[PDB]
Structure 1
Amino acid sequence: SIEKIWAREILDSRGNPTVEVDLYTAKGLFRAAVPSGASTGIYEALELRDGDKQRYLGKGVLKAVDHINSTIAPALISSGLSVVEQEKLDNLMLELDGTENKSKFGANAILGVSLAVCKAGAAERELPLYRHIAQLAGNSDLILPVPAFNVINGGSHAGNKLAMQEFMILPVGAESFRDAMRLGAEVYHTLKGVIKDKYGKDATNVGDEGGFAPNILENSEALELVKEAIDKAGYTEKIVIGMDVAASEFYRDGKYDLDFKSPTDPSRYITGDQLGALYQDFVRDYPVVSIEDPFDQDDWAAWSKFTANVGIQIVGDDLTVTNPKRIERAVEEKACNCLLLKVNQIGSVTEAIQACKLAQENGWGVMVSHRSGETEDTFIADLVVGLCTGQIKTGAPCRSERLAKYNQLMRIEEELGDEARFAGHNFRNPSV
């Protein structure tokens, strides 16, 4: 049973308050923290902020902390349920909140506890956390993912004008996870100098996820820079490109504006079909193997058309919000073929696991993901191994809210010793 739960307000990687939960059992202390998105989809579970304009610019999480401390904490303790009983414990919390979108407590309140529970569970099972998650998911194998490194950072929040949010490199050709980290870091440092040589030093600072926002419009130019860095580093045969367009961020009146980061202008807008044709060119002309959120979260027609006309990975993020209800719709409509897995878009371990399973049962890939506001928490490193999904995105190899996950994945790899396999070229369907 749970002995004590105690939440507090810590700061995330952008300097904003977020929830952290300590849970005590007879096995000791287990700590977890909650991430927070910037480009958040409209269908994500509620992130409860205080909105006290005078305190932390309305971003405090004092209310979510109080729901855990004053409400969740004593209920869960009183149940006497064991921390191994993840599903029981998550469900009690959902019922206590009584709202579909977790708007009574906040998804941030529920998730902090869910995460701390899962870590306690592991200990009570005397297993490492990735093995506990594996068993929670019914997996009897494990695999290290190909990491996807967001090296050219962009979007609605972008220290810059580029419309599409993320330009990632994936070392599919690497020998192991630790080698994938080498290839990513080397290409990162090479890209820094390509940017400096072309754009000057001013352009070598970093964005929220640790990548660069050189000052460019054309998304093709971001791909060209990434392609150059990969080649200058000597890894053309081994590294390919994934994108996150985050198209819901520049959806305007039924169309799409490839410059929305400038002062408004209805005249620069294009149709979904024009957007689709641009992506076909990117896939022909660059080693682009995955595109995430190519259209808006509500533009179902565009998704299903695009996905049927390509062979690449198409990742739902804002479309799917790690939510089994939306995933079902996406499966029926053949909208996408990969799920982005964000524990905080849904708000419990149990539901994210259910979402992963649903995608997988249906022939989808799954890419585990950070949020752009992260913490020192490294849960998602054990989750991606435990769920055997083969791919994770959790930042450039820069800023340690990113590296803490990458370094944990290297530890899990070393830990598996001989037993370690690396997804490599089968990142889309590692189950082989």
Structure 2
Amino acid sequence: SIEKIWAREILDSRGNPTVEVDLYTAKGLFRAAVPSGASTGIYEALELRDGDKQRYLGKGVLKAVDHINSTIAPALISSGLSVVEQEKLDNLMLELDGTENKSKFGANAILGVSLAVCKAGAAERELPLYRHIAQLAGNSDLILPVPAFNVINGGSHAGNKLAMQEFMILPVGAESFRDAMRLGAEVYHTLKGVIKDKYGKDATNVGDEGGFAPNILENSEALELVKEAIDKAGYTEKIVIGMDVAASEFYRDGKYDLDFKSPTDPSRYITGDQLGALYQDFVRDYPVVSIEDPFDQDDWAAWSKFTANVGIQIVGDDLTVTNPKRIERAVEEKACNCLLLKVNQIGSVTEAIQACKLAQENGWGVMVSHRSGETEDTFIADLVVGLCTGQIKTGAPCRSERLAKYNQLMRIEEELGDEARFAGHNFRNPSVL
């Protein structure tokens, strides 16, 4: 049923090129765009950039766009497949690319088309996108997720010394998704005033994901500021904390650097055991219920040891790269107990859905995620509701590449009406609701 495919370069939320795809059927135009990370795992599917150093500092995506327009488009048009056939269309692309890591076309070329196909397929079925994704995944009973808002940005997403990437608030005690937005926004605005009072107005500019970027160094101080703002806002009993350490970003010679944005000094490196003990303190002193990428993507022993010794959610991101092969190993080694789901780590909607179901079948949580370079696309709002995962991270409640998803989640909750169920304290396993 595909009539025409046309891709172009747009700019993402950091001002870098990315791929957008228009796909036409008899039902109209369906448009999707692809996100892009900065703290990208070494095992992610290849993001194809042009490397023309004069043009966009080598970050153009004209090669991927030309792959879609000149090669992928006719191939899918020639297949005569309906756009409801997500798996057959995705398989066609994966086979035409022919490499393990989508390095011929780029994962960004293939994903852009895969997302546009899924939106077209929804229209073909006369279904909202979240319901079409539920059907693809084999789910019936949809769930609005707890949002995890990154309200202090550090690591590779902000100009400060703060090494850990993300400090998030999860309004598990909210009444609804729309009430979760109010809780998160109120804590965020209260947090601004906490930071301004303590560190001055000049500490309240934001990092790449909209979280404030105060020029602090201690990760316990970020946790302190977040706990203060939750309490000041009146929500101690309703809002808990999650972290994405992104420890691969500061992994240095078998050790870890908590001042990695400062000129090098190997004497400050701590070991993985020292790092884990610091996490145990955070878990004891603050309401931390989830830690993502606490150790490097290859540091398997540290992950399996930490996971065995805590009762909280431990999330694979650069460890697992939304990749069934790496997920199978993490399940076997009990490396973690939740998968961060990033469609662009693996490069297709079908593979991402496969990765989600593999985690869920092994009793893991799944947290759908944005990338730090996002667009105005809102696909992952419909994806998290259709996959019924119960949790999504897609930014602070600041910068509309983040709010576009949160706003779409409010619209979905509205659409579902009395059938809406919010994951609340069952964010790790919302199936019980």
> Shorter chain as normaliser: what TM range?
over 0.9
Q: Distance in 2 between matches of 1:159 and 1:211?
A: 12
Q: Measure how far apart 1:62 and its partner are.
A: 0.2
Task: Report the CA distance between 1:87 and its aligned residue.
Answer: 0.1
Give the whole-Å Cα distance in 1 for the aligned partners of 2:430 and 2:11. Answer: 35
For the residues of structure 1 that align with 2:22 and 2:243, how far apart are their CA atoms?
A: 36
Cα offset, 1:158, TM superposition? 2.1
Deviations 1:178-223 (A, max 9, x none): 0000000000000000000000000011111001110111100000
Shift of 1:340: 0.1
Q: Distance in 1 between matches of 2:213 and 2:265?
A: 22
> How many percent identity over aligned positions?
100
CA distance in 2, matches of 1:157, 1:253: 22
Secondary structure of 1:74's aligned partner: helix
**Deviations along 1:13-57, whole A, 9 cap, x unmatched?**
000000000000000000000000000000000000001000001
How many residues end up aligned between the 2 structures? Answer: 432
Tell me the C-alpha RMSD between the 2 structures.
0.4
Displacement after TM superposition at 1:257 (Å): 0.9
74-83 vs 151-160, which moves further: 151-160
- Post-superposition CA distance 1:327-376 (Å, at most 9, x none): 00000000000000000000000000000000000000000000000000
In structure 2, distance between residues paired with 1:179 and 1:266: 46
Contact 1:8–1:20 (8 Å) recurs in 2 = yes
**2:306 paired residue number:** 306
Given that 2:368 and 2:380 are in contact with CA atoms closer than 8 Å, whether structure 1 keeps it comes out as yes
Contact 2:367/2:390 (<8 A) preserved = yes
| Cα offsets for 1:247-291 (capped at 9, x unmatched) | 000001111111111000110011111100100000000000000
Q: Is the 8 A contact 1:156 1:260 kept in 2?
A: no
Shift of 1:224: 0.2
Query: CA contact under 8 A between 1:67 and 1:105: conserved in structure 2?
Result: yes
Q: Determine helix, strand or coil for the equivalent of 2:395.
A: coil
Within 2, Cα distance between the matches of 1:213 and 1:127? 41
- Residue 159 of structure 1 deviates from its aligned partner by 1.1
Which residue in 2 is equivalent to 1:77? 77
For 2:189, what is the secondary structure of its paired residue?
A: helix
SS at match of 2:256: strand
Question: How far apart are the structure 2 equivalents of 1:98 and 1:69?
Answer: 18
Query: Could you tell me whether the CA contact under 8 Å between 1:276 and 1:306 is conserved in 2?
Result: yes
Do 1:144 and 1:385's aligned partners in 2 also have CA atoms closer than 8 Å? yes
After the TM superposition, which of the residue ranges 153-162 and 174-183 deviates more from structure 2?
153-162
| In 1, Cα distance between equivalents of 2:129 and 2:142 | 12
Gaps of 5+ in 1: none
1:56-81 Cα shifts (integer Å, max 9, x gaps):
01000000000000000000001100
SS of the residue corresponding to residue 336 of structure 2 reads coil
Query: In the aligned structure 2, how far is the partner of 1:339 from the partner of 1:308?
Result: 17
Aligned equivalent of 2:27? 27
Say if 1:339 and 1:359, in contact at 8 Å, map to a contact too.
yes
**Does the aligned pair in 2 maintain the 1:7–1:68 contact within 8 Å?**
yes
CA deviations 1:71-110 (Å, max 9, x no partner) are 0000000110000000000000000000000000000000
CA displacement 1:380-407 (0-9 Å, x = unmatched): 0000000000000000000000000000
1:113 Cα deviation from its structure 2 partner: 0.1
Q: Structure 1 residue 46 and structure 2 residue 46: aligned?
A: yes
Q: In the aligned structure 2, how far is the partner of 1:187 from the partner of 1:273?
A: 33
Q: What is the DSSP-based 3-state SS (H/G/I as helix, E as strand, rest coil) of the residue aligned with 1:168?
A: strand
1:408 corresponds to 2:397: no
- Partner SS for 2:431: coil
In the aligned structure 2, how far is the partner of 1:215 from the partner of 1:264?
A: 18
Kept in 1: contact 2:158–2:206 (CA 8 A) = no
* Corresponding residue SS for 1:197: helix
* 2-structure distance, mates of 1:36, 1:157: 13
Counterparts of 1:320 and 1:50, CA distance in 2: 27
TM-superposition CA deviations, 1:266-319 (whole Å, max 9, x none): 100111111001000000000000000000000000000000000000000000
How far apart, in 1, do the equivalents of 2:62 and 2:275 lie?
A: 42
Preserved CA contact (<8 Å) 1:340 1:369: yes
Match of 1:116, SS state, is: helix
- Aligned partner of 2:319 in structure 1 is 319
In 2, Cα distance between equivalents of 1:359 and 1:281? 28
Q: 1:156 offset after TM fit, Å?
A: 2.8
How far 1:122 moved relative to its partner?
0.3
**Distance across 1 between alignment mates of 2:228 and 2:418:** 35
CA contact (8 A) 2:315 2:337 kept: yes
Question: Is contact 2:157-2:209 (8 Å) kept?
Answer: no
The alignment's TM-score, normalised by the length of structure 2, stands at 0.99
Q: How far does the alpha carbon of each residue in 1:118-170 deviate from its partner, in whole angstroms, 9 at most, with x for none?
A: 00000000000000000000001100000000000000342100010000000
Partner residue in 2 for 1:176: 176
Matches of 1:157 and 1:345, distance apart in 2: 18
Counterpart Cα distance in 2 of 1:96 and 1:226: 48
Structure 2 CA distance for aligned equivalents of residues 57 and 378 of structure 1: 27
Measure, in 2, the Cα distance between the counterparts of 1:161 and 1:344.
28
Cα distance in 2 between the residues matched to 1:403 and 1:253: 38
CA distance in 2, matches of 1:166, 1:347: 24
Unaligned ranges ≥5, structure 2: none
Contact 1:64 1:108 in 2 (8 A): yes
3-state DSSP of counterpart to 2:88: helix
Partners of 1:257 and 1:111 in 2: CA distance = 34
d(CA) in 2 for partners of 1:333, 1:157: 30
SS at match of 2:340: strand
Asked if 1:341 is matched to 2:341, the reply is yes
User: SS at the partner of 1:156?
Assistant: helix
Does the 8 Å contact 2:157/2:207 carry over to 1? no
Map 1:49-60 to 2 at 5 A.
49-60=49-60
